[PDB]
Amino acid sequence: PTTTPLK
Numbered sequence: 001p002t003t004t005p006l007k
């Protein structure tokens with residue numbers, strides 16, 4: 001389970 005790129 002990964003995540004999106006921090007804005």
Ligand SMILES: *[C@H]1O[C@H](CO)[C@H](O)[C@H](O)[C@H]1NC(C)=O
Pocket residue numbers: 001002003004
């Ligand atoms: C985390 O990154 C992976 C790539 O290895 C997938 O794109 C996955 O869908 C991502 N998870 C989220 C919650 O964006």
Ligand SMILES: *[C@H]1O[C@H](CO)[C@H](O)[C@H](O)[C@H]1NC(C)=O
Pocket residue numbers: 003004005006007
């Ligand atoms: C990145 O975007 C994804 C879209 O599914 C999720 O909302 C995730 O929580 C976001 N990550 C951050 C750090 O905001």
